[PDB]
Short mmCIF file of C-alpha atoms and ligand atoms in Angstrom, two decimals:
data_model
loop_
_atom_site.label_atom_id
_atom_site.label_comp_id
_atom_site.label_asym_id
_atom_site.label_seq_id
_atom_site.Cartn_x
_atom_site.Cartn_y
_atom_site.Cartn_z
CA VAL A 1 157.97 134.06 89.46
CA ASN A 2 157.45 135.03 93.49
CA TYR A 3 161.02 133.71 94.71
CA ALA A 4 160.81 132.43 98.12
CA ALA A 5 156.86 131.35 97.20
CA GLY A 6 158.41 128.86 95.02
CA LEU A 7 156.36 129.58 91.76
CA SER A 8 157.10 128.81 88.18
CA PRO A 9 159.09 131.42 86.22
CA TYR A 10 158.02 130.50 83.06
CA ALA A 11 154.66 131.88 82.82
CA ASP A 12 153.38 134.03 80.07
CA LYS A 13 152.13 137.00 82.37
CA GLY A 14 150.39 138.06 78.94
CA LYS A 15 149.27 141.88 78.24
CA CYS A 16 149.80 144.18 81.11
CA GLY A 17 149.70 147.57 81.96
CA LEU A 18 147.50 148.69 78.92
CA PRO A 19 145.67 152.17 79.99
CA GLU A 20 142.43 152.58 81.93
CA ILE A 21 139.52 154.04 80.49
CA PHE A 22 136.42 155.87 82.08
CA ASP A 23 133.09 156.37 80.31
CA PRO A 24 131.75 159.70 80.88
CA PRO A 25 129.28 160.10 83.68
CA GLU A 26 126.06 160.34 81.41
CA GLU A 27 127.05 157.18 79.18
CA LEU A 28 127.75 155.23 82.69
CA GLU A 29 124.54 155.94 84.23
CA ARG A 30 122.61 155.05 81.09
CA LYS A 31 124.57 151.78 80.60
CA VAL A 32 124.26 150.82 84.38
CA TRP A 33 120.27 151.58 83.82
CA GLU A 34 120.85 148.88 80.66
CA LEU A 35 122.58 146.35 82.97
CA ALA A 36 119.85 146.48 85.66
CA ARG A 37 117.26 146.01 83.07
CA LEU A 38 118.96 142.96 81.62
CA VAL A 39 119.73 141.63 85.30
CA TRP A 40 115.86 141.81 86.04
CA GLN A 41 114.76 140.56 82.49
CA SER A 42 116.98 137.82 82.66
CA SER A 43 116.12 134.06 84.72
CA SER A 44 119.79 132.39 84.81
CA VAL A 45 122.45 135.38 85.67
CA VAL A 46 126.29 134.21 85.93
CA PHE A 47 128.96 136.78 87.31
CA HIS A 48 132.57 136.22 86.67
CA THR A 49 134.99 137.85 88.83
CA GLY A 50 138.40 138.82 88.75
CA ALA A 51 141.26 140.66 90.77
CA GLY A 52 139.66 144.08 89.71
CA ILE A 53 136.95 143.87 92.62
CA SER A 54 139.42 143.36 95.32
CA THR A 55 141.47 146.67 94.32
CA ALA A 56 139.43 148.57 96.31
CA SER A 57 140.24 146.39 99.53
CA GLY A 58 144.03 147.18 98.69
CA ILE A 59 145.06 144.06 97.07
CA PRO A 60 146.59 144.86 93.60
CA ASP A 61 145.50 143.27 90.54
CA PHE A 62 148.02 141.52 88.39
CA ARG A 63 147.80 143.48 85.00
CA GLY A 64 146.48 146.90 85.83
CA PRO A 65 148.76 150.23 85.56
CA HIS A 66 150.27 149.10 89.07
CA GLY A 67 149.50 145.12 88.74
CA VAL A 68 151.94 142.78 90.33
CA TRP A 69 152.85 141.22 86.75
CA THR A 70 152.80 144.72 85.52
CA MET A 71 155.78 145.97 87.87
CA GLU A 72 157.49 142.63 87.90
CA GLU A 73 157.82 143.06 83.99
CA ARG A 74 159.40 146.69 84.39
CA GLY A 75 161.91 145.54 87.23
CA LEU A 76 159.79 146.78 90.10
CA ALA A 77 158.34 145.44 93.27
CA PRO A 78 154.61 145.05 93.90
CA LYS A 79 152.91 147.06 96.21
CA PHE A 80 150.51 146.02 98.58
CA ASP A 81 148.31 148.16 100.84
CA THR A 82 146.79 145.47 102.90
CA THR A 83 147.44 141.58 103.95
CA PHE A 84 145.04 138.93 102.83
CA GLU A 85 143.95 138.06 106.33
CA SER A 86 142.89 141.96 107.02
CA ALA A 87 141.45 142.69 103.48
CA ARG A 88 137.37 143.34 103.87
CA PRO A 89 135.14 142.35 101.29
CA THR A 90 134.28 145.43 98.94
CA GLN A 91 130.66 146.75 98.18
CA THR A 92 131.06 144.70 95.03
CA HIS A 93 131.61 141.69 97.13
CA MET A 94 128.83 142.49 99.10
CA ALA A 95 126.55 143.23 96.45
CA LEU A 96 127.09 139.83 95.08
CA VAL A 97 125.99 138.26 98.45
CA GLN A 98 122.69 140.03 98.22
CA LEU A 99 121.96 139.48 94.79
CA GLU A 100 122.62 135.48 95.32
CA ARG A 101 120.10 136.10 98.54
CA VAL A 102 117.13 137.33 96.24
CA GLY A 103 117.73 134.97 93.36
CA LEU A 104 118.90 137.43 90.81
CA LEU A 105 122.16 135.35 90.75
CA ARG A 106 122.25 131.63 90.00
CA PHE A 107 126.24 131.00 90.25
CA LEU A 108 129.26 133.02 90.78
CA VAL A 109 132.84 132.01 88.81
CA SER A 110 135.92 133.69 90.38
CA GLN A 111 139.63 133.46 89.52
CA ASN A 112 140.60 135.09 92.78
CA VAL A 113 142.38 133.82 95.29
CA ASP A 114 141.92 136.55 97.49
CA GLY A 115 139.41 134.19 99.99
CA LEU A 116 137.20 137.39 100.21
CA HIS A 117 134.07 135.81 98.54
CA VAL A 118 133.87 132.85 101.00
CA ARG A 119 134.70 135.26 103.73
CA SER A 120 131.95 138.05 102.69
CA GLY A 121 129.67 135.16 103.30
CA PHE A 122 128.85 134.11 100.15
CA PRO A 123 127.40 130.37 100.01
CA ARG A 124 130.31 127.86 98.61
CA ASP A 125 127.92 125.62 96.48
CA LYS A 126 127.26 128.59 94.36
CA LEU A 127 130.82 129.49 93.65
CA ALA A 128 133.73 128.22 91.52
CA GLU A 129 137.26 129.17 92.70
CA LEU A 130 138.94 128.36 89.84
CA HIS A 131 142.22 129.37 90.70
CA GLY A 132 142.21 128.44 94.16
CA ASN A 133 141.69 130.09 97.51
CA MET A 134 144.60 131.22 99.97
CA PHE A 135 142.71 130.11 103.04
CA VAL A 136 141.65 126.50 101.74
CA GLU A 137 144.09 123.42 101.64
CA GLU A 138 143.05 119.95 100.56
CA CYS A 139 143.93 116.82 101.45
CA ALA A 140 145.78 114.41 98.84
CA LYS A 141 144.02 111.40 99.81
CA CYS A 142 140.66 111.93 100.47
CA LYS A 143 139.77 115.64 98.88
CA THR A 144 138.73 117.08 101.61
CA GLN A 145 138.99 120.73 101.92
CA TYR A 146 139.74 122.70 105.02
CA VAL A 147 138.67 126.40 105.00
CA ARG A 148 140.98 128.30 107.41
CA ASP A 149 141.07 131.98 109.17
CA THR A 150 144.39 132.48 108.17
CA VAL A 151 146.29 131.89 105.01
CA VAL A 152 147.56 128.07 104.84
CA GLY A 153 151.05 129.29 103.77
CA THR A 154 152.26 127.51 100.62
CA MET A 155 151.12 128.03 96.90
CA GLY A 156 151.60 125.60 93.78
CA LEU A 157 149.54 122.65 95.30
CA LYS A 158 152.63 122.18 97.75
CA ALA A 159 152.37 120.48 101.16
CA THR A 160 151.31 122.91 103.94
CA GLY A 161 152.94 120.26 106.56
CA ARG A 162 149.64 119.68 108.35
CA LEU A 163 147.77 116.22 108.13
CA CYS A 164 143.92 115.28 107.39
CA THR A 165 142.03 114.90 110.61
CA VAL A 166 139.00 113.24 109.05
CA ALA A 167 137.57 110.31 111.15
CA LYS A 168 136.70 107.60 107.98
CA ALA A 169 133.47 106.26 107.32
CA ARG A 170 134.06 102.51 108.46
CA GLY A 171 137.00 102.10 111.24
CA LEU A 172 136.81 105.95 112.14
CA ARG A 173 140.58 106.38 112.40
CA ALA A 174 141.99 109.71 111.27
CA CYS A 175 143.02 109.86 107.53
CA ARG A 176 146.09 111.20 107.90
CA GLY A 177 147.02 112.34 104.27
CA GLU A 178 148.98 115.30 103.17
CA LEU A 179 147.33 118.63 103.17
CA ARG A 180 148.09 120.85 100.26
CA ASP A 181 147.37 124.55 99.21
CA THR A 182 144.96 125.11 96.19
CA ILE A 183 146.85 127.64 94.74
CA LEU A 184 147.13 126.85 91.10
CA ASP A 185 150.56 127.79 89.22
CA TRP A 186 151.10 128.61 85.93
CA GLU A 187 149.76 125.35 83.80
CA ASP A 188 148.51 123.60 86.67
CA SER A 189 144.96 121.66 85.72
CA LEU A 190 142.11 123.52 87.24
CA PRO A 191 139.90 121.59 89.94
CA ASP A 192 137.60 119.28 88.27
CA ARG A 193 134.46 119.72 90.02
CA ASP A 194 134.51 123.27 90.03
CA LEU A 195 135.37 123.78 86.48
CA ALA A 196 132.58 121.37 85.76
CA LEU A 197 129.80 123.70 87.49
CA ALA A 198 131.36 126.70 86.01
CA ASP A 199 131.20 125.47 82.94
CA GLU A 200 127.31 124.14 83.37
CA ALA A 201 126.45 127.35 84.81
CA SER A 202 128.05 129.46 81.71
CA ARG A 203 126.59 127.33 79.25
CA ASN A 204 123.02 127.48 80.53
CA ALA A 205 123.39 131.21 81.76
CA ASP A 206 121.45 133.42 79.45
CA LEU A 207 123.06 136.81 80.96
CA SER A 208 127.09 136.24 81.82
CA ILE A 209 128.60 139.45 83.46
CA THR A 210 132.30 139.91 84.31
CA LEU A 211 133.62 142.26 87.07
CA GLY A 212 137.37 143.59 87.02
CA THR A 213 139.18 140.69 84.92
CA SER A 214 141.21 141.31 81.63
CA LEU A 215 140.02 137.69 80.37
CA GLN A 216 143.24 136.77 79.27
CA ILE A 217 143.86 133.45 81.39
CA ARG A 218 141.68 130.39 80.02
CA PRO A 219 139.88 128.74 80.65
CA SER A 220 138.22 130.88 83.03
CA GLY A 221 138.16 133.96 80.66
CA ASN A 222 136.25 131.91 77.98
CA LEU A 223 133.72 130.86 80.08
CA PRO A 224 131.62 134.15 79.54
CA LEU A 225 131.57 133.19 76.09
CA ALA A 226 129.90 130.02 76.33
CA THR A 227 127.07 132.09 77.10
CA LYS A 228 127.07 133.81 74.00
CA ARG A 229 127.34 130.70 72.07
CA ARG A 230 123.90 129.57 73.28
CA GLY A 231 122.02 133.13 72.97
CA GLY A 232 122.86 134.90 76.07
CA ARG A 233 124.22 138.46 76.48
CA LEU A 234 127.72 139.14 77.70
CA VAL A 235 128.26 142.19 79.80
CA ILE A 236 132.26 143.21 80.70
CA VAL A 237 132.75 145.76 83.46
CA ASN A 238 136.49 146.75 83.46
CA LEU A 239 138.70 149.70 83.36
CA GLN A 240 141.18 148.33 80.81
CA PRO A 241 140.16 146.58 77.84
CA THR A 242 139.63 143.20 77.67
CA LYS A 243 140.51 140.02 75.47
CA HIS A 244 136.85 140.11 74.49
CA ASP A 245 135.67 143.05 74.35
CA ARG A 246 134.47 142.74 70.74
CA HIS A 247 131.99 140.17 71.93
CA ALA A 248 130.33 142.10 74.79
CA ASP A 249 126.73 143.17 74.19
CA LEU A 250 127.34 145.76 76.76
CA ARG A 251 130.72 147.45 77.97
CA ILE A 252 131.16 149.43 81.04
CA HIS A 253 134.65 151.43 81.79
CA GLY A 254 134.05 152.32 85.40
CA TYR A 255 134.87 151.38 88.88
CA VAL A 256 133.39 148.66 89.77
CA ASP A 257 132.14 149.35 93.12
CA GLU A 258 130.06 152.35 91.47
CA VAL A 259 128.77 150.40 88.98
CA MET A 260 127.49 147.72 91.35
CA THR A 261 126.21 150.66 94.03
CA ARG A 262 124.07 152.15 91.15
CA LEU A 263 123.11 148.93 90.48
CA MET A 264 121.61 147.91 93.58
CA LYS A 265 119.79 151.23 93.58
CA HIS A 266 118.10 150.74 90.66
CA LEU A 267 116.90 147.01 91.59
CA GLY A 268 115.90 148.43 94.80
CA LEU A 269 118.52 146.29 96.99
CA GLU A 270 120.29 147.50 100.08
CA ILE A 271 124.37 146.29 99.87
CA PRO A 272 124.83 144.88 103.71
CA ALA A 273 127.35 145.84 105.78
CA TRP A 274 129.96 142.74 106.53
CA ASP A 275 130.31 141.50 110.27
CA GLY A 276 133.41 139.67 109.84
CA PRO A 277 134.75 136.12 108.25
CA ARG A 278 131.39 133.96 107.60
CA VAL A 279 131.95 130.94 106.27
CA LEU A 280 128.61 129.80 104.45
CA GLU A 281 128.62 126.13 103.20
CA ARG A 282 125.36 125.99 101.71
CA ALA A 283 122.95 128.82 100.22
CA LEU A 284 120.35 129.83 102.51
CA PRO A 285 116.82 129.15 101.47
CA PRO A 286 116.03 131.95 98.73
CA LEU A 287 114.76 135.42 99.84
CA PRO A 288 111.58 136.45 97.63
CA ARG A 289 112.27 138.00 94.36
CA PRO A 290 112.10 141.74 95.32
CA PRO A 291 109.11 144.46 94.04
CA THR A 292 109.47 144.95 90.12
CA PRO A 293 111.86 148.03 89.83
CA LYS A 294 111.35 151.50 88.63
CA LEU A 295 112.46 152.75 84.72
CA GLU A 296 114.68 155.15 83.91
CA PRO A 297 113.99 159.26 84.76
CA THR B 2 141.74 118.37 82.63
CA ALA B 3 142.32 121.84 81.36
CA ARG B 4 144.97 123.99 82.25
CA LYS B 5 145.87 127.31 83.55
CA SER B 6 147.40 129.28 80.68
CA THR B 7 147.28 132.27 78.35
CA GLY B 8 146.82 129.48 75.46
CA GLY B 9 149.06 131.10 72.59
N1 AR6 C 301 138.05 149.07 90.63
C1 AR6 C 301 137.78 148.44 89.21
N2 AR6 C 301 136.57 148.72 88.53
C2 AR6 C 301 137.07 148.09 87.70
N3 AR6 C 301 138.13 147.39 86.93
C3 AR6 C 301 139.18 147.32 87.52
C4 AR6 C 301 138.98 147.84 89.17
N4 AR6 C 301 140.52 147.91 89.58
C5 AR6 C 301 141.04 147.09 88.50
N5 AR6 C 301 140.27 146.83 87.73
C6 AR6 C 301 140.69 146.11 86.30
O1 AR6 C 301 140.64 144.78 86.61
C7 AR6 C 301 141.53 143.95 85.58
C8 AR6 C 301 142.06 142.94 86.17
O2 AR6 C 301 142.70 141.79 85.34
P1 AR6 C 301 144.07 141.27 85.60
O3 AR6 C 301 144.85 141.91 86.76
O4 AR6 C 301 144.33 140.37 84.34
O5 AR6 C 301 143.96 139.79 86.62
P2 AR6 C 301 142.46 138.85 86.03
O6 AR6 C 301 141.78 138.57 87.69
O7 AR6 C 301 141.65 139.01 85.17
O8 AR6 C 301 142.84 137.47 86.39
C9 AR6 C 301 143.82 136.85 85.53
C10 AR6 C 301 144.69 135.43 86.58
O9 AR6 C 301 146.08 135.90 85.95
C11 AR6 C 301 146.86 135.84 86.98
O10 AR6 C 301 148.07 135.11 86.77
C12 AR6 C 301 146.14 135.25 88.49
O11 AR6 C 301 146.05 133.65 88.18
C13 AR6 C 301 144.57 135.84 88.06
O12 AR6 C 301 143.78 134.86 88.84
C14 AR6 C 301 142.47 144.97 84.83
O13 AR6 C 301 141.76 144.75 83.29
C15 AR6 C 301 141.85 146.36 85.40
O14 AR6 C 301 141.83 147.31 84.65
C1 8L9 C 302 150.23 136.61 107.69
C2 8L9 C 302 151.21 135.63 106.97
C3 8L9 C 302 151.75 134.58 107.52
C4 8L9 C 302 152.48 133.77 106.43
F1 8L9 C 302 152.68 132.58 107.11
C5 8L9 C 302 152.85 134.32 105.53
BR1 8L9 C 302 153.93 133.35 104.28
C6 8L9 C 302 152.33 135.28 105.02
C7 8L9 C 302 151.41 136.46 105.65
N1 8L9 C 302 151.19 137.51 105.14
S1 8L9 C 302 149.61 137.76 103.76
O1 8L9 C 302 149.46 139.10 103.95
O2 8L9 C 302 148.65 136.68 104.37
C8 8L9 C 302 150.62 137.47 102.62
C9 8L9 C 302 150.26 136.08 101.76
C10 8L9 C 302 150.47 136.02 100.39
C11 8L9 C 302 151.41 136.85 100.06
N2 8L9 C 302 152.01 136.40 98.37
S2 8L9 C 302 153.75 136.45 98.24
O3 8L9 C 302 153.93 135.39 97.11
O4 8L9 C 302 154.58 136.82 99.45
C12 8L9 C 302 153.90 138.02 97.06
C13 8L9 C 302 152.99 139.13 97.12
C14 8L9 C 302 153.27 140.32 96.48
CL1 8L9 C 302 152.15 141.69 96.57
C15 8L9 C 302 154.17 139.96 95.57
C16 8L9 C 302 154.81 139.07 95.04
CL2 8L9 C 302 155.99 139.06 94.05
C17 8L9 C 302 154.88 138.17 95.92
C18 8L9 C 302 152.09 138.12 100.21
C19 8L9 C 302 151.21 138.64 101.73
C20 8L9 C 302 151.83 139.53 102.23
O5 8L9 C 302 153.03 139.35 103.18
O6 8L9 C 302 151.51 140.54 102.17
C1 HDR C 303 149.13 141.39 99.12
C2 HDR C 303 149.12 141.18 97.61
C3 HDR C 303 149.07 139.79 96.62
C4 HDR C 303 148.44 139.75 95.86
C5 HDR C 303 149.11 138.99 94.62
C6 HDR C 303 149.58 137.98 94.97
C7 HDR C 303 149.57 136.23 94.27
C8 HDR C 303 149.06 135.39 94.00
C9 HDR C 303 149.75 133.95 93.46
C10 HDR C 303 149.06 133.50 91.97
C11 HDR C 303 149.81 132.56 91.27
C12 HDR C 303 149.35 132.60 89.98
C13 HDR C 303 150.00 131.62 89.18
C14 HDR C 303 149.19 131.41 87.86
S1 HDR C 303 149.16 132.26 86.21
ZN1 ZN C 304 141.92 113.18 103.89
#
């Protein structure tokens, strides 16, 4: 599909280029108030993110009106406003960080390979990156991951041409195994651990909220349904329709940054600014739950 | 081990 990238040209791209819907301003405000109630009211909240949450940073999505697959399907080159290294976390990224700090977010499941959740400061132990991360390479022998500052340079679980530097438990001489990228190609198996954690988080969630995914790729796209299957609610935030629209308790057609901005105001939380790449391996001890938010005027 | 696809 990406020719020098060496990825499979046999992929089903799914449904590309559906038109975007925008809920009218009055209906948006009402729906976002309803989301805020649901966040507050709910104990276990899981977010599911896709490419739609990095469009504001200048990274294209896959199946939107100017998505990478959409353009390929109609014979055009994709367009990218920024590089992966120089992309900046959005308000949505930064909002999710704050929601995690205050205990309003149990787990975050993402299909994005852009590295922006990690670089935003979001704790890695509350994050499943189900399709990989451009910045993360992994040792074939011992499974040790390396988070880098620049993209590792291959895709499709290929060798990056660097070796493992871990000194072993008994002997403490270098492992030397082959480091590979973590970017899944079409029909590669997902990461065992990350999927299991995402699945368990999703099963036991009482609210799943999807942001900026069309939910066409499995198993990622079906994880938000497991929530509904055990009595939970499902909120879908997306400009295009999604594959699972019919199962949503609440559906919001608007820009995701707007929704998250309004969501945080209703909860009385500030969205932090971003200092720069800050890899956080373990979640900091929880901030106290904020004071009860005020009801709709 | 579950695979990344559209599944249909
Ligand atoms: N600012 C925004 N606000 C809300 N929605 C938006 C915004 N920008 C775009 N969207 C919506 O965001 C949605 C993006 O959906 P898709 O482009 O299918 O990508 P995926 O992340 O679900 O995952 C597809 C996987 O498949 C690939 O092969 C890779 O492997 C991916 O990991 C669209 O419906 C847009 O309308
Ligand atoms: C800084 C850098 C060092 C490298 F070694 C390599 Br390779 C690339 C970069 N640039 S990067 O921003 O991180 C970078 C990383 C990955 C890709 N992906 S890609 O497979 O080329 C590709 C991109 C798009 Cl939008 C459409 C298609 Cl069809 C294929 C692009 C860039 C970039 O050039 O924008
Ligand atoms: C810079 C902008 C680049 C955005 C898109 C880069 C392509 C990511 C490659 C993912 C491969 C998908 C295979 C699974 S199906
Ligand atoms: Zn190793």
